[PDB]
Design a protein around this ligand. Structure first.
Ligand SMILES: [Mg+2]
Length: 923
């Protein structure tokens, strides 16, 4: 398809804040890696440093960090004081957005009305999101230790407490919507996670949106700003840090990687428009491709078969002879297994044309920037293509060679070299979970192609396979029966679902809750450990895997095929429990010191271990891989040996509807045969109830739907299989998705604009709609906007919402609505059309039209895992530790000093955050 021009670039990398500064550092072979400090960890790092294999410790503090960056919050379309109170994650993304648009010459342009943004991002806790959840666990730990040790015992806060805006918990998807609002973008926006490949996934999909005309300009970039303690504990349990402290991509002596943080952004336009408008072109994206490794390797290990495949797909897409590639910016992280596999893959592919391109890795200078890792790689390659110079890979003294000696150090510049027919470069990124991307780049040019291929025309999507697990409605058949009988799944909180925290009077007082709300909780799931290869994986991933597997079977899918897996989700907020455990190391030490009780080292470790085990289990290898959101999509692709892209997609409540839009685009721009769209939100956690209370009151009793003033608790997971309508048979089809459309904003006007677009796309009139599936969230501003817009649009249609049956499932809520609607249309025995409306914290309105089809769809070691976990207080107060008796006697009758910083509960109080429709922070 058409050449894409890069017309603006920005970076915030370890060591640099602008592309020319970064380039000069590369030319000078600057090492930008450094040791983490309390600025990164919020604690003294030495207290958490030990040897490999030591529990709750990391064995390496080296990384690529962002030091001495002072964000300027002025000059955006959102108020300075609001933006100043957001995490590095948000601020770094806003910074590179402003810089990249200003570089391209479009900051504040009316052209931004047709500009979208796709953002690679980690679904991990951030330094700010921790502040919103830690006091839940630590108040309970504090009160248990008072009961065990001394009524005046006081636990210290995990770090210096800071007042923290609730929006800092919207980690995965909201940063992309915030960029769109703060820069005035009017096009599509979402975040995605493809682990180390997310930057090139974002660029490739943004090119796709340009090729289908969904936008006339796109921002594509990524940000890596997770809590460094969470990141480094993970790479320590993975044993990914080098035992000899040598991180040296391509070097024989390298034993591992160092991780890193930062952000990057690029501005993309079709080359025809860039030449017409007189933009500065940095480079041409000639083509590229995505792939998944499919079956064969552990979720953290690369598979050469998927890497060769993405090369084949990329040069075919670019229509470029692989003989012409001069330089490849490699994924090479310094991990031995991965460095050798990538060298084998490149040997296999390029030896077919007898080409030996130069090779390099900017991970040598910066570390591995995780979701942002592709940004410095692509920036290096595009600047090298424009300037005709290739910077060195640093610290490379004794280079590896490929399996058969095809590539050696002769192809790896260790100084700046001149460039070795357009100058042509490849960029490769190979992420955890088998997620691969390769982009083909060429030097900038004003010359337009005379002939290029075009995207396929869009078609309605046919839903051919579905499964659902909402509350106690544990499969599609049970959900269908529930809906037809107008029943609900509302129940009291399962005993272990909040780890017993609903019994803590101080926590519940802070949350202003008389009781845990009645709601559609999932108490447990049954799963076949044999089929799914299950140190257990967290329920977020197990729930998604089960429904996706069932939907794939229901849709008649076939193993080994080019099928994509998109998972709509936001972060598992229960991931904060892991640092909730780990941080008690210094919290308990500080408490004992400050209060004046001098235990032995062995007594203090035993006391600390008892408290830790109450909160969470110590990190284990497989369990930590399930903390990584994109891996749940990869696990399905590995089970089915699928080769399409496998990613998570995050856009808050509109996550699923952005997946529908993406699936349509994937069929237009690639040869993918089917797309699984799965969705999961275990939104009955205490963390989610805490978070959503900041936006409006919950219905504690769990019991015109638009007239409700409180939201209902629910949780679960569901999945659908979609194919283009022209490629399914009648007996497969539940219902068709005829249109999905979006409009910026959250008010009644935005609803009518999105609805008009969707009705036009579907080819029907508003009077053709039989009924309306309202969002009906129970947040008053959203309900009130729908009460205005929907009866006006559809005066003769009845309005209802699936949330009345199974509650508000937040990041999965679009899937509940689609599946309810598809089941109803599949039952039609009256051409019938139903509209679905969507609102959320992403500040856009989604509107969908679904339609009935000719026929009803034709149907084709089990272990129980409970959600939640061990009761925190009981695990501490009833501990069977023998040495606990002697510790209690060291406390008996003593006067304790007050601690300097006790656990603070202020951030738990419902914050009263105004809805997007109020425009409270719009300048
Ligand atoms: Mg092309």
């Amino acid at each position: 398809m058409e050449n894409i021009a890069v017309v603006g670039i920005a970076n915030l990398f370890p060591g640099s804040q602008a592309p020319d500064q970064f380039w000069q550092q590369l030319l000078e072979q600057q090492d930008c890696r450094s040791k983490a400090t309390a600025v990164q960890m919020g604690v003294d790092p030495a207290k958490y440093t030990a040897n490999k294999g030591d529990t709750d410790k990391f064995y390496c503090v080296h990384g690529g960090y962002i030091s001495d960056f002072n964000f300027d919050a002025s000059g955006y379309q959102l108020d300075n004081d609001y933006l100043a109170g957001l995490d590095d994650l948000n601020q770094w993304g806003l910074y590179v957005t402003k810089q990249a648009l200003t570089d391209a010459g479009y900051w504040g342009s009316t052209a931004l009305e047709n500009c979208g943004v796709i953002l690679g991002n980690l679904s991990f806790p951030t330094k700010s999101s921790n502040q919103l959840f830690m006091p839940l666990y630590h108040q309970v730990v504090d009160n248990a230790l008072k009961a065990v040790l001394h009524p005046d015992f006081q636990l210290t806060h995990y770090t210096a407490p800071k007042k923290t805006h609730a929006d800092n918990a919207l980690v995965a998807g909201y940063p992309a919507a915030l960029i769109a609002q703060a820069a005035g973008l009017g096009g599509s926006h979402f975040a995605l996670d493809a682990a180390c490949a997310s930057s090139c996934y974002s660029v490739k999909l943004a090119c796709d949106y340009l090729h289908t005309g969904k936008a006339n300009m796109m921002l594509a970039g990524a940000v890596s700003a997770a809590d460094p303690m969470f990141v480094n504990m993970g790479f320590s349990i993975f044993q990914a840090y080098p035992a000899n402290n040598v991180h040296a991509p391509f070097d024989q002596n390298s034993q591992g990687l160092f991780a890193g943080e930062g952000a990057g952004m690029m501005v993309l336009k079709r080359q025809s428009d860039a030449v017409r408008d007189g933009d500065h072109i940095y480079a041409i994206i000639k083509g590229g491709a995505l792939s998944n490794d499919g079956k064969g390797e552990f979720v953290l290990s690369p598979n050469t078969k998927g890497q060769v495949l993405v090369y084949e797909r990329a040069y075919a897409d670019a229509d470029v002879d692989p003989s012409t590639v001069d330089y490849i910016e490699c994924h090479a992280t310094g991990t031995p297994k991965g460095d050798n596999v990538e060298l084998r893959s490149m040997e296999t592919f390029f030896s077919r044309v007898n080409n030996k391109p130069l090779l390099g890795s900017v991970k040598s200078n910066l570390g591995h920037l995780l979701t942002a890792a592709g940004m410095p790689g692509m920036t290096k390659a595009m600047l090298a293509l424009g300037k005709g110079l290739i910077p060195a890979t640093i610290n490379l003294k004794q280079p590896l060679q490929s399996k058969n000696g095809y590539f050696t150090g002769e192809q790896m510049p260790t100084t700046t070299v001149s460039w070795p027919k357009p100058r042509t470069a490849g960029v490769s990124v190979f992420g955890f979970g088998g997620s691969n991307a390769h982009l083909v780049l060429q030097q900038p040019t004003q010359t337009l192609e005379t002939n290029f291929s075009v995207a396929k025309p869009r078609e309605p999507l046919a839903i051919i396979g579905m499964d659902s697990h909402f509350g106690s409605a544990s499969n599609l058949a049970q959900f269908k029966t529930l809906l037809n009988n107008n029943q609900n799944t509302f129940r009291e909180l399962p005993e272990q679902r909040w780890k017993g925290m609903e019994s803590n009077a101080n926590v519940m007082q802070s949350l202003q809750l008389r009781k845990a709300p009645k709601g559609s909780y999932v108490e447990q799931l049954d799963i076949d450990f044999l089929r799914f290869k299950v140190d257990c994986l967290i329920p977020q991933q197990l729930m998604m895997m089960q429904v996706a597997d069932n939907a794939a079977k229901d849709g008649g899918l076939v193993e080994g095929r080019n099928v994509a897996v998109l998972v709509a989700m936001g972060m598992e907020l229960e991931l904060h429990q892991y640092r909730g455990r780990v941080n008690l190391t210094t919290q308990i030490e500080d408490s004992l010191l400050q209060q004046g009780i001098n235990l032995t080292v062995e007594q203090r470790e035993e006391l600390t271990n008892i408290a830790k085990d109450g909160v969470a289990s110590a990190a284990q290898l497989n369990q930590y891989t399930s903390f990584i959101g994109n891996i749940m999509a990869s696990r399905i692709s590995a089970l089915w040996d699928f080769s399409g892209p496998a990613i998570t997609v995050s856009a808050e409540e509109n996550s699923v509807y952005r997946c529908v839009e993406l699936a349509e685009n994937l069929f237009q721009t690639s040869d993918v045969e089917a797309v699984i769209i799965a969705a999961v939100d275990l939104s009955g956690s205490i963390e989610n109830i805490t978070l959503r209370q900041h936006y409006g009151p919950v219905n504690e009793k769990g019991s015109n739907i638009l007239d409700q003033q409180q939201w209902l608790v629910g949780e679960g997971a569901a999945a659908i299989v979609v194919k283009p309508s022209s490629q399914v048979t009648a007996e497969q089809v539940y219902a068709r998705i005829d249109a999905v459309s979006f409009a910026p904003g959250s008010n009644a006007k935005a609803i009518t604009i999105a609805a008009d677009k969707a009705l036009t796309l579907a080819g029907i009139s508003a009077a053709d709609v039989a009924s309306v599936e309202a969002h009906a969230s129970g947040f008053s501003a959203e309900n009130n906007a729908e009460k205005t817009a929907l009866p006006t649009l559809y005066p003769s249609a009845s309005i209802s919402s699936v949330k009345a049956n199974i509650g508000h499932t937040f990041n999965a809520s679009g899937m509940a609505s689609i599946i309810k609607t598809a089941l109803l249309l599949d039952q039609n025995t009256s051409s019938k059309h139903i509209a679905i409306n969507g609102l959320g914290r992403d500040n856009s309105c989604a509107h969908l039209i679904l339609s009935s089809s000719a026929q009803a769809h034709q149907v084709a070691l089990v272990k129980t895992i409970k959600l939640g976990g061990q009761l925190i207080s009981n695990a501490i107060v009833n501990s069977a530790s023998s040495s606990l008796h002697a510790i209690k006697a060291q406390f008996a009758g003593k006067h304790l000093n007050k601690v300097n910083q006790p656990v603070m509960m202020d951030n738990l109080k419902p914050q009263g955050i105004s809805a997007h429709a109020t425009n409270e922070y719009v300048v």
